[PDB]
Amino acid sequence: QKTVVVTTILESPYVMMKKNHEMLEGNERYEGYCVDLAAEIAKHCGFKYKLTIVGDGKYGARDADTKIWNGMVGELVYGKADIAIAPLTITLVREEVIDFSKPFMSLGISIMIKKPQKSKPGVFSFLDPLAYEIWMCIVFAYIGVSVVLFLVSRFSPYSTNEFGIFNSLWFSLGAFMQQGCDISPRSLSGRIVGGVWWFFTLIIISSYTANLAAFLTVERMVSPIESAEDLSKQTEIAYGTLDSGSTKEFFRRSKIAVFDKMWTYMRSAEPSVFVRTTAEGVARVRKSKGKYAYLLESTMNEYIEQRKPCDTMKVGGNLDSKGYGIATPKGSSLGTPVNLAVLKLSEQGVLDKLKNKWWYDKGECGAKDSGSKEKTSALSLSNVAGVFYILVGGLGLAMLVALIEFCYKSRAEAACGRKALTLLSSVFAVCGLGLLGIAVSTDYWLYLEEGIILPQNQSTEVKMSLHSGLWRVCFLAGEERGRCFTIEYVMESTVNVLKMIRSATPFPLVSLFFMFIGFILSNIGHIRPHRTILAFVSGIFFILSGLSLVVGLVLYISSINDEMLNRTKDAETYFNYKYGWSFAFAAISFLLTESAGVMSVYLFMKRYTAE
Amino acid sequence: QKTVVVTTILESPYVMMKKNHEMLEGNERYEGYCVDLAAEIAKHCGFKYKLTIVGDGKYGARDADTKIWNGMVGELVYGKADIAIAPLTITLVREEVIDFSKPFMSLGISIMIKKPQKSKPGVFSFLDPLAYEIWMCIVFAYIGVSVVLFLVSRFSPYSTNEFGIFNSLWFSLGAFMQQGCDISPRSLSGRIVGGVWWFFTLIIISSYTANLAAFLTVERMVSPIESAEDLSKQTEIAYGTLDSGSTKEFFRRSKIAVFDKMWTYMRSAEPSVFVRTTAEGVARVRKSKGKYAYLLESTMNEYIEQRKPCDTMKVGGNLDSKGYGIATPKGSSLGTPVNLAVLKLSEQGVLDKLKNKWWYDKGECGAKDSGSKEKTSALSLSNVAGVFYILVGGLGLAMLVALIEFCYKSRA
Amino acid sequence: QKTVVVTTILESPYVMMKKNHEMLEGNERYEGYCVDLAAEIAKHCGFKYKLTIVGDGKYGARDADTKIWNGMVGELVYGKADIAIAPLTITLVREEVIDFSKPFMSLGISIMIKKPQKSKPGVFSFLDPLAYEIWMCIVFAYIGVSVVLFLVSRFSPYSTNEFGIFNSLWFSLGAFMQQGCDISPRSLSGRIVGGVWWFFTLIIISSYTANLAAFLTVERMVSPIESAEDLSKQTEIAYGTLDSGSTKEFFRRSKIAVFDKMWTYMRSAEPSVFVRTTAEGVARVRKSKGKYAYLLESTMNEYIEQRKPCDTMKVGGNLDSKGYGIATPKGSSLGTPVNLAVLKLSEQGVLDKLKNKWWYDKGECGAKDSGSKEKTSALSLSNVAGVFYILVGGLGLAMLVALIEFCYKSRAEAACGRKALTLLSSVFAVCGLGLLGIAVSTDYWLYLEEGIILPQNQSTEVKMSLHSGLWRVCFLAGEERGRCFTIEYVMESTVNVLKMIRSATPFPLVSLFFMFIGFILSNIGHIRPHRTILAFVSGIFFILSGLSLVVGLVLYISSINDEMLNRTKDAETYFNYKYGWSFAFAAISFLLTESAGVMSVYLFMKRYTAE
Amino acid sequence: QKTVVVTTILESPYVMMKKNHEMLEGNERYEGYCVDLAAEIAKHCGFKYKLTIVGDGKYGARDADTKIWNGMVGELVYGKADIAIAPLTITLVREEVIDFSKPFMSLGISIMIKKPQKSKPGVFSFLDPLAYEIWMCIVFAYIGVSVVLFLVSRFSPYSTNEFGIFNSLWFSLGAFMQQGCDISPRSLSGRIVGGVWWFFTLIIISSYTANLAAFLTVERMVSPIESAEDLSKQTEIAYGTLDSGSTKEFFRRSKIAVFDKMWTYMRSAEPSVFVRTTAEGVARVRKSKGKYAYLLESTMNEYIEQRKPCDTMKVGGNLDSKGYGIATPKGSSLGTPVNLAVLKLSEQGVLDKLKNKWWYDKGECGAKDSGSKEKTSALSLSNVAGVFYILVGGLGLAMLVALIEFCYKSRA
């Protein structure tokens, strides 16, 4: 008896080329699932076979014009082959011309998404419930309360008062942390400043606990996709199929209410969700950061999942039911013994043994299914790592302060302070005047950039950029030219920002007017050491200078933030902002002005004692 | 056989030109709602048709001088067209010269406003979790406990009177603010007052923190107006219509008491609320931060809501009632089968199937497009900005007290 | 010319009988909307009319057998009338036989729900985040810490210690409220009891703030129904239509995807959602506590809303579009002048004027639409009323204690304590032994009732009830008989509860064994006042008696609560529980045993001082 | 014309008897899935039919002694029936005597477990918002701060040494527990240690309270097992099949390494995991509190899930593959038009439309029936029960310390 000619198509992992395919001849060139299946059927039916490949590379369809078949269905009908052992779907139009066996594999439409990965949080992500502009203003308000509580306590008739500057910074730190205090204010003016600082720290701590609970609750409500119902109702993730095939024709003629709504989305969608081939459809899933899902066959979805780089995952269940079968020509002697051989292999578990060998045992994603089990939700050390770093760094600093003050006291035991306090008061005052005087004149305060993204390419293109000041605006990228207008010379939202910068104008000018008064009285007190009231009055103008600058910065930053708030959001437009080095000089000028006001009071008390 | 000439006008989404209209020719150039309606009626009635745009570009009116109709009504009277499938409003003046069918779409006058978004927080928005009648009862109870703690401690001593009237206010302030106090009561009648006032503050502070967590988690936004009578009873938000059309003529000759008050406002208003075109009226709504409301037809108001940048919405219901009809010349043979076709499509749900396809399915933003996007944000400085202002104001007032204490120490 | 016969049907508010309808003749018997509309049309067309009522009471339809019409459509086709001014819907099968005008009213399908009312919260609803069994055990733990901290401090060599019983109850109260303390423990055994009570109060206070935020967040996510989309996706509220009419036939033949899902629910629903008439459909809405919604015409929905008792509300927009029209016979001279009269009345606002007069100006729900505007969410005085009542009641008690102790000190100024302390120690001990001895012997500890509801009638029918003890169970309603078995004589979930009562058995027997030891040593100390160690040792057995009973009650109540937790919940089954008067005798026995242990230590110290 | 005799078997929801079956007669008595399938095939093929229940009540088998088929297969071989529309499993032994069509339903072996519900809380479930590696780093940092506060305070005095090694542990314990302390540091190097340790506890306690509010608001429940390989790697949960059928014979002659380990467990297991009937196997799942899992076919497992009291669910996927077919006698003239009818119904989505109607639309509890019901509950005593046990255990240990201190005071 003569050999049976077997036709097959090249698909992985069904039939693949072996590596030594130039050096081998005959049936040993090939390997795969269908090669091992052809050896099993030929053992039961009892024939010899020569294994070939279809020349066209198609599965089989009828031309509407010429009414002829192509592919593997063509080689069966027109006589070129005797059996077709290949992933050939049992359909109606193929059943009328050839004979299929019972199915040896069941499959359907499935869903491919990108695998969820774990992103490590930042080390200082515990600071996230409040903006960084609040954490800066708490430190400014802490210095402001501690200086005023000193001045309002150590007056000229003071009795036996205790609130020096070292006790005042320790009282305010204990009140903010709600840890109690060793001593309390007893004067009526001391209780006013102590009472308002209690109401400040009550609102801030309750705002941190409340907004942190809002982060952890919204993150817990986020649930992934696990069915085809969830894709239909949820429209931040795009999904599409291949451009021409049986998968697209399924959603077209369907009448199921779930699948009608999915074809309504894929019909009217800009840009195209349909891809041209399978490799293009997988490549969109891997790079779109979890925003794209792909619909394909159930067996290719399980094969790509077991390959490197191991970054895709199959979710849900199948949407329909199909089958693959062995095909013979109509009216052949191989019709019945092939059909009994498939049912015999299916009951001895041999068909389930070959699927485990090619899909999983040659899997490069080694035992990936074990990693899908673990899931929990609690705080870990990655969330609160930066709190321990501040604790270690605080203990290391206390070792250094205990060491250098140990050697400083031993050296002392085994009008110098008046002269050193005189010279330190003057250097901080000149640096206090000069740093604010530069900052008001210059105009590098706020940077603003507005741009538009380019989709599907990961690139942004700006349209406008500038830097602004209190009176002068110079475009850095406006008309690609360094043109400079005043704020009165107008020309959208960026116009409304520039008007609010003009609103908070007077408060730095109040502070600059007050330091210049205190600078004159401080030098003429150094000229004439008699009439010692000049040092105490000059200290008050330094403290009123800094508190006038605090309400200037709070009202400035508040006027900036709400102008980004009222604008309409878009998915294609980004808007950023950034401070400048003039804003840093105003904040540094606060630190030098308050510190020079404290030294003037110690200059008063040490000089009034000698008088 | 004879080709019926169908006249129409070009307005979205009724009749639109396709993007490759230079390639195609004839009926394949056009698309829209009224094109799909022309295909359904010609199938039931049984004729063939050729779509033509009207040359004048107007719906229809009568000149008082020359008495000549212009527009789609002018083509039906003088014979240039056979049927007008278009949004033509069924009125009395047009009814005397041509014939309409039953209405295939019902509409009215509605209100367009800007969508409510996240707003600028007020300076005293930190005291929003508790109502105003709670904050005043805390102050009244603060004075009441400190008076009772003084009176009880006076005539019942147990040496020195550590609890005066000035020290009792300092004990009760430190107890509310979760801080400690240096002195404590030492009598049975004194420790009952301190014990109850401690249990008071543990409930109030825990109720404040628990209600901020409900606000920051779930975001509910409300619209200011929801009816036409609310616009008559306010003056914060301005409102107006287009300068020439049937919308302005409705508010002029209205005898309804609500609609007559609205016309006295719109007539004597400076600056002018009236606009030139439709797009200028939409543009004032988007730029005025929610201080302007535009009054237009309900079918356009639902169409602008479904287009980019998706910024507007419709509030309330319709103000009047009117309809759109299909017009034939007086005495045509098409008048009766067109009339029976519209009532047949309406009961089969086909007219609801076409409006659902062009208004909602072609919408750039769906109902669940805006619904799926949520995010949570860090607190900005503008939220807790009012707490800083009380702090600096308390620092300034504390220095004024120390001045007038020294003056009372200098005179003494 | 002859009078025109006008046919009409009796519907409110279209045509109604006037009150003097027996005493009037002609057209003045009737009133309504259609009576005022008939006077307007007859003014423009210029005729005289006599107004009649159709005899059948139907609107009009064709019999499938005999092919004849009935109702008002019948009187037009067969010649009995000349015009029909009535709410007659423009449909296709009516258009072929008679002539309608243009519509004078537009309407559709709408939704009727019960109006949301405001329910006042309880005065003590601030206690709701914790169960009442926790608030009881905090008070027991407060007494237990304050006694042990006294005993562990006032030992026999004590120096200069301060922790008496009046300072110990004040230290523990300040630690629970986190308000600080005047003095602290200094002995190592005093710091252990002070440290664990700090960890108890940290977990309890953090549990109250966290669960209160869970109440207010879930209540804020609850959103009502405002569209037909929300009825389809949300299935705790049933909705139905009338049993036979055009409203039901709309949902049957519809092909809209939203309306297909609504007919799928109303088809397969047990029991019946369909009602027989309109008055039955409104009556189900008013009594089903907001669990039922009704679908009806748009104009009857707006008319019922303006009538007493004013408890229904219209939500959403219309689902379809219909019209009402004037009908004349086909081929009549009244065809064209009626059609021009309707368009003339519609443009002069006269049709909108008559609708305001009958629907709203005769409205009994006077200006109800103004009350729908107000909406806010914050805590009010109704939520926290009980906190102010405790504050007022605490200040009123302090007035009474300050008054009676004022008269008590003035009377004293202008072995008695040993004898009174001797007799008070013995009476509390006998009452301590006798109250627990009754409670262990009896078996009225826990009541359990299980039943099943009866739907749509607001009535419950029990199936089983009993009371239980530590060894004996007697059924109160089991087999409607007072039968009594032991727990070993078993016969579901109630069996599992009864085994857990056996689990917490030993701990009351440990406490009863310890008081009987302390009772013997206390009396023989009263017999022999020498050898004064008998009073101090007997005080320790009283304190160890109560602490053994605390862990008995905690383990008992924990074993009860989780047995209601593991059972499967049903909408038709209710399960309740309740304590008995044996449980009250064990809790009272704790108060007498601890108090007798404190008096024994003062009996020791006052007697050892005289020795 | 000739009436075709259709044989079938009575199993829900395939073939069921209607409730008023005594009134009706003939084909009107029955309803179900396979009755609707018989109406569709007789319409395409073009015949009339008369439904009969098989008298034996069995699907089909062959006696080894008498070699006589019994059941629905026995009626097709010996001529009493013409076609068998029923869930008849396509096997090899039945294929040699009759002919099947292509499969109209695909199924396999699945796993039934009890639904995850709210569980009994453990005694130490109060420390669930923070992980175990955080609680040990708090203890390690507690010792580290108290040692540094001692060493710094010793050789740098500023009189008396208020901060010993025993007083430093008491300062740091009161600082973590939000209480106050009576003594405070008085040096620059000492106040830095107290300042940083205060900012540590403000973040940790606020992170504990914020994460309990996330747990109590949103309830997520997890199932223990989700695959067949998880049952092989555990011994907490028992599992078994029915005593006689194709489900037990699958695990016997299986050479797969996962399925062979499962048979060594099920054979040598005491007490017996095997049951008598299907309803007894479902009953052990509902009563054993989630310690038993039953292995059955996937089509019944989806049907029990949609019935009252709605207590079970299906986990994982199928273990094998098999199908159901329509059987005709070998050599009938109906064999080819029945085969082409099943492939025609399957592509038109009609077989998915019938399974969706009987499994899900007739379900007593839907997917959104269990989804719409939410409620929030007060904390019970069993949640915070472990905190009471530490308190009483601390009270007992404090009395043992005072005994051994007096003995060291008596010897001294």
Curated annotation (Swiss-Prot), chains A, C:
Intramembrane segments: 163-178, 179-181
Disulfide bonds: C310-C365
Source organism superkingdom: Eukaryota
Glycosylation sites: Q1
Residues the entry annotates as binding L-glutamate: P87, T89, R94, S246, T247, E297
Main location: membrane
Tissue expression remark: Detected in forebrain. Detected in dendrites of neuronal cells. Expressed in the pyramidal cell layers of CA1 and CA3 and in the granule cell layer of the dentate gyrus.
GO CC field: AMPA glutamate receptor complex; asymmetric synapse; axon; cell surface; dendrite; dendrite cytoplasm; dendrite membrane; dendritic shaft
Up-regulation conditions: Down-regulated in the pyramidal cell layer of CA1 in the hippocampus by global ischemia.
PTM annotation: Palmitoylated. Depalmitoylated upon L-glutamate stimulation. Cys-181 palmitoylation leads to Golgi retention and decreased cell surface expression. In contrast, Cys-407 palmitoylation does not affect cell surface expression but regulates stimulation-dependent endocytosis. Ubiquitinated by RNF167, leading to its degradation.
Site for Crucial to convey clamshell closure to channel opening, residues: I225
Residues recorded as bearing Phosphoserine in the entry: S254, S288
GO molecular function list: AMPA glutamate receptor activity; amyloid-beta binding; cytoskeletal protein binding; extracellular ligand-gated monoatomic ion channel activity; extracellularly glutamate-gated ion channel activity; glutamate receptor binding; glutamate-gated calcium ion channel activity; glutamate-gated receptor activity
Keywords carried by this UniProt record: Cell membrane, Disulfide bond, Glycoprotein, Ion channel, Ion transport, Ligand-gated ion channel, Lipoprotein, Membrane, Palmitate, Phosphoprotein, Postsynaptic cell membrane, Receptor, Signal, Synapse, Transmembrane, Transmembrane helix, Transport, Ubl conjugation
Outcome after substituting L92Y: Promotes dimerization. Strongly reduced desensitization
Residue stretches spanning the membrane: 132-152, 188-208, 384-404
GO biological process terms, semicolon-separated: cellular response to amine stimulus; cellular response to brain-derived neurotrophic factor stimulus; cellular response to glycine; cerebral cortex development; chemical synaptic transmission; conditioned place preference; establishment of protein localization; ionotropic glutamate receptor signaling pathway
Site (Interaction with the cone snail toxin Con-ikot-ikot): R62, R252, K344
Ranges per topology, Cytoplasmic: 182-187
Subunit structure: Homotetramer or heterotetramer of pore-forming glutamate receptor subunits. Tetramers may be formed by the dimerization of dimers. May interact with MPP4. Forms a ternary complex with GRIP1 and CSPG4. Interacts with ATAD1 in an ATP-dependent manner. ATAD1-catalyzed ATP hydrolysis disrupts binding to ATAD1 and to GRIP1 and leads to AMPAR complex disassembly. Interacts with GRIP2. Interacts with GRIP1. Interacts with NSF via its C-terminus. Interacts with CACNG2, PICK1 and GRIP2. Interacts with GRIA1 and SYNDIG1. Part of a complex containing GRIA2, NSF and NAPA and/or NAPB.
Family membership noted in the UniProt record: Belongs to the glutamate-gated ion channel (TC 1.A.10.1) family. GRIA2 subfamily.
Comment on protein domains: The M4 transmembrane segment mediates tetramerization and is required for cell surface expression.
Additional notes on this entry: The postsynaptic actions of L-glutamate are mediated by a variety of receptors that are named according to their selective agonists. This receptor binds AMPA (quisqualate) > L-glutamate > kainate.
Protein role: Ionotropic glutamate receptor that functions as a ligand-gated cation channel, gated by L-glutamate and glutamatergic agonists such as alpha-amino-3-hydroxy-5-methyl-4-isoxazolepropionic acid (AMPA), quisqualic acid, and kainic acid. L-glutamate acts as an excitatory neurotransmitter at many synapses in the central nervous system and plays an important role in fast excitatory synaptic transmission.
Entry protein name: Glutamate receptor 2
Native source species: Rattus norvegicus
Shown chain mapped onto the complete sequence: 413 to 843 of 883
